[PDB]
């Protein structure tokens, strides 16, 4: 069996008896009519593609759809499908990797709600909301861990914005799950070794694709902070004294742009609006966050396209059946919105630009805008190419190859 | 000496003594006070790198400096640079390449400027204009042949339009330049073998950089045409029924289809204009204008990054220092336009959206709006970065690599 297809169907099926357990569920409250079924299989797609694409308010979620989607998510975290990998294909490691998986979501969901109870600070903000302390901090811990960013609160974390302990507090995870996932292992497998030798000196790799050669560990934890630091610079250059950072103080604006640099990659966590920053900085984002995680600066199947004319179809696709609203409202679609969103269900980080209404060229009729953060493209055939885009993207590191026949001069 | 370095000082060298002979030269009559240096050494540059980037005028320009430029980017089209090339490396196939360079030029404008003179219909226009008839038949071959693409009249070939002829009798001049040069380069050598079998049969290749194996000539044929009619099917698919294509024929709007379809490559002639037309179709022409030419679908120095990323950093520069114009006019300066002209200068095409005013969110004061064609970005720092990029794709064959140290997984 090629992993390729059998993680295909592991998520297919996960999303699909995700989208069912959440339609029976019941809705928070009773005065929000169930959304569409298309917004449902969304929020499934989305939390099992670890991403975000929120697509529906996260207030208009249960305390039972927000557990479901917690365990909805974290199966399909990019470490547990790498221990359930590991499984079939052991049939060691596999226990480390489990045992940290449990350390690190135990540490984070006991102490982001030891923070969110002791000091009170931006604690009432989540009990108005309807949520629990305890079912929000394993649902930030779950996503975040997960690097998928999906927020319990509508607002995502701008609301938690003007406070840096939800920031710091909670990012670390996005450092231990996704990117800088093997460079931990290696660095804590060191200490384990006061005890397992074959894992860690250079060898077969054991099979393990998410393990690296101890050059790679430090050549990769060099790119990423390279890169955090990188776009750190650029939002702190270009959006310091932006109307969206007005009223933070030095120290609580630069929380924020630290979370957002690090979140860009492939988390998803926003704490500003992708709408009010400029452009040179969202391109930076894109560019950052088509990157996959394990890309390294090394300083030491022929039908298939290359991941970036993959990209380029979709995105001419997106553009060729979502007319006379690029052409309506282009500020809103802009192509450059289009790309960001195509390459976050791509990159599975879920940034999004939101549909501020103010921003449409003419106010016309009736625009109660939604809390959503741009629902994909607000129509069916955009919602299903951006989920087919998604699906593309969760298991890119099995179509990174590409090209070949598209041979260059 | 690195090829690299020896072009560049050619390029760099030729452009600088176009920049000096078009200041000296007078100006069309006397009412047009000359262009600011950056224009005009603007102008030389894309004179030079075969591509157009108007900036300026070209009814602001004398019959002195249309021969100017004619031999400005005559000096400077791809098989007269290989030519020079060879010539250098000789030191047989050279007097062949020569020979055919003249013949196609020969063939174009004692073609052309008989399609003017014996049947009027558009060629009171070139009158109007004040371009002579040889002028102009001279500089479009040159310009088309060339790949460039820089076109007499103010207009460009939309003055052209509704009339097919300078458009199927000048683009057959763009497929036998820049992409389909090595195609018809064997197909030729295939009849002068009646008299040279070592240049045809598999070899060392001569050392000729734009020479391919027979099975590549016809493998390169076969994405020409699956790309052109790929580009001709979209646009006919969307933009068919427009309002920039409403008073044409079916035939007289068919024929500007195909033109812009096969210019889209590497030459750059525009019969309409890139605003009025769906972002769906100016993405695929940025998708399918990033390609080099000798781009085949074969179905049968660690400091440097690779050329999408060289342009990913182009474009994050570009909306760095370009600022206070995207955040004031979105629509004219948005990021699809940027991106497209900064692919434009890279890809050698010249393809320029305009900067139509009637487009400003909201017309502030005096906007008499050239007709130059989108002048780069209207600042001098963009204009030096747009030219720099210019370079950068002109000598590409020589850049291509880049990536191997950036590590994917």
Same mark, same amino acid.
């Given at each position: ?6 993680? @295909?169907?592991?998520?297919? #099926?996960?999303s699909? $008896? !995700?989208?069912?357990?959440?339609? =029976? &569920?019941? +809705?928070?409250?009773? *005065? ?42 974290? @199966?399909?975290?990019?470490? #547990?499908?790498?221990? $359930? !990998?590991?499984?079939?294909?052991? =049939? &060691?490691? +596999?226990?480390?990797? *489990? ?31 309807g ?7 394993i ?62 000196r ?8 998410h ?108 553009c ?26 791509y ?12 921003r449409?060229?003419r ?26 885009v ?7 590191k ?12």
């Open positions: 069996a090629h992993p390729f297809w059998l993680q @295909l169907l592991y998520f297919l #099926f996960i699909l $008896l !995700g989208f069912l357990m959440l339609k =029976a &569920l019941p +809705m928070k409250t009773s *005065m929000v009519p169930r959304p569409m079924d298309l917004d449902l299989i969304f929020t499934s797609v989305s939390a099992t593609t670890v991403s975000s694409m929120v697509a529906v308010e996260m207030e208009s979620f249960s305390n039972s759809q927000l557990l479901l989607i917690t365990l909805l998510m974290l @199966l399909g975290g990019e470490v #547990f499908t790498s221990i $359930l !990998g590991l499984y079939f294909t052991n =049939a &060691l490691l +596999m226990f480390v990797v *489990m045992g940290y998986h449990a350390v690190v979501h135990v540490a984070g969901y006991t102490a982001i709600v030891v923070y969110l109870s002791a000091v009170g600070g931006a604690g009432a903000v989540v009990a108005g909301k949520i629990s302390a305890h079912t929000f901090a649902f930030t811990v779950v996503s975040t861990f997960a690097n998928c960013g999906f927020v319990p609160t509508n607002e995502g974390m701008v609301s938690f914005r003007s406070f840096p302990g939800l920031l710091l507090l909670v990012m670390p995870h996005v450092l231990l799950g996704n990117t800088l996932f093997p460079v931990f292992l290696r660095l804590a497998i060191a200490a384990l070794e006061r005890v397992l030798l074959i894992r860690r250079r060898g077969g790799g054991e099979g393990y694709h393990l690296l050669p101890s050059s790679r560990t430090r050549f990769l934890a060099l790119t990423v902070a390279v890169l955090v630091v990188a776009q750190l610079a650029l939002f702190c250059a270009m959006e310091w004294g932006s109307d969206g950072l007005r009223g933070l103080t030095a120290g609580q604006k630069l929380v924020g742009a630290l979370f957002m640099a690090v979140n860009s990659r492939h988390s998803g966590e926003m704490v500003l609006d992708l709408s009010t920053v400029s452009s040179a900085v969202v391109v930076l984002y894109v560019v950052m966050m088509y990157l996959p995680p394990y890309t390294t600066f090394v300083p030491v199947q022929k039908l298939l396209m290359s991941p970036l004319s993959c990209l380029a179809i979709f995105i001419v696709v997106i060729i059946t979502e007319r006379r609203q690029i052409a309506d409202d282009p500020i809103n679609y802009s192509v450059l919105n289009i790309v960001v969103e195509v390459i976050s269900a990159g599975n980080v879920g940034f999004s630009t939101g549909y501020s209404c103010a449409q060229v106010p016309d009729g009736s625009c109660r805008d939604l809390w959503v953060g741009f629902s994909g493209k607000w129509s069916k055939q955009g919602k299903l190419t951006l989920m087919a998604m699906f593309y993207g969760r298991l890119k099995f179509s990174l190859h590409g090209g070949q026949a598209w041979k260059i001069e």
